[PDB]
Amino acid sequence: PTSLCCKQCQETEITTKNEIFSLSLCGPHETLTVYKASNLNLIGRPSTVHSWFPGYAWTIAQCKICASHIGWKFTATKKDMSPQKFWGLTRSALLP
Ligand SMILES: O=C1CC[C@@H](N2C(=O)c3ccccc3C2=O)C(=O)N1
Ligand SMILES: [Zn+2]
């Protein structure tokens, strides 16, 4: 009911509406950023190439059940950043 599940298989809860926060600046969208996620397997090592959140690297994250590409784990390159990690999830890969 606050639950966001992999659209492809509908088995797994990936995150909840409670975990949602915003990195985007409110002064002078398609990607959902959450503090915490579940049931995702990480593929490969982190990379900073073309990172959508400067200062973070990304690791591909797919549903552990059906292997659908739901988003990425973003990890901080520097110790002084917060949060040190979060998830960027493709909204259309989630239900609702
Ligand atoms: O933060 C990110 C993570 C995902 C990442 N990405 C793509 O989705 C992608 C698709 C095809 C080639 C290269 C990339 C690429 O680096 C991207 O451009 N930025
Ligand atoms: Zn799935």
Author numbering: 321 to 348, 360 to 427
The paper states:
In an effort to clarify the differences in CRBN binding at the structural level, we determined the structure of mouse CRBN TBD bound to (S)- or (R)-thalidomide and refined the structures at 1.8 Å and 2.0 Å resolution, respectively. Similarly, the 16 (R)-thalidomide molecules display essentially the same conformation, which is distinct from that of (S)-thalidomide and exhibit a small averaged rms deviation of 0.074 Å. In both enantiomeric structures, the phthalimide ring is tilted against the glutarimide ring by 75° so that two protruding carbonyl groups of the phthalimide ring are docked into grooves at the pocket entrance: the phthalimido 1-carbonyl group into the groove between Trp383 and Trp403, and the 3-carbonyl group into the groove between Trp389 and His381. In sharp contrast to the relaxed form of the bound (S)-thalidomide, CRBN-bound (R)-thalidomide has the glutarimide ring in a twisted conformation, which is distinct from the stereochemically relaxed C4-exo puckered conformation of (R)-thalidomide, suggesting that bound (R)-thalidomide is structurally constrained in a metastable conformational state. The twisted conformation is forced primarily by the contacts between the phthalimide ring and the entrance of the tri-Trp pocket and accompanies a large displacement (1.7 Å) of the phthalimide ring toward the endo direction. This displacement needs to avoid steric clash of the phthalimido-1-carbonyl group against the groove formed by Trp403 and Trp383, and enables the protruding carbonyl groups to dock into the grooves. To visualize the steric hindrance, we superimposed the free form of (R)-thalidomide onto the CRBN-bound form of (R)-thalidomide found in the crystal. We found that the C4-exo conformation of the free form causes serious steric clash (2.6 Å) of the phthalimido-1-carbonyl group against the ring carbon atom of Trp383 (indicated by a dotted line in Fig. 6). The twisted conformation of the bound (R)-thalidomide avoids this clash by shifting the phthalimide ring toward the endo direction (1.7 Å, green arrow). Moreover, close inspection of the glutarimide ring puckering by modelling revealed that (R)-thalidomide in the C4-exo puckered glutarimide ring conformation causes steric clash of the C4-carbon atom against Trp383.
Thalidomide directly binds cereblon (CRBN), which was originally reported as a cerebral protein associated with mild mental retardation. CRBN is a highly conserved protein that forms a CRL4-type E3 ubiquitin ligase complex, CRL4CRBN, with Cul4A and damaged DNA binding protein 1 (DDB1), and plays a key role in limb outgrowth and expression of fibroblast growth factor Fgf8 in zebrafish and chicks. CRBN TBD consists of eight β-strands (β1-β8) with a single zinc ion, which is coordinated by four conserved cysteine residues from two CXXC motifs located in the β1-β2 and β5-β6 loops. The central β-sheet (β4-β5-β6-β7-β3) contains the tri-Trp pocket formed by Trp383 (β4-β5 loop), Trp389 (β5-strand) and Trp403 (β6-strand).
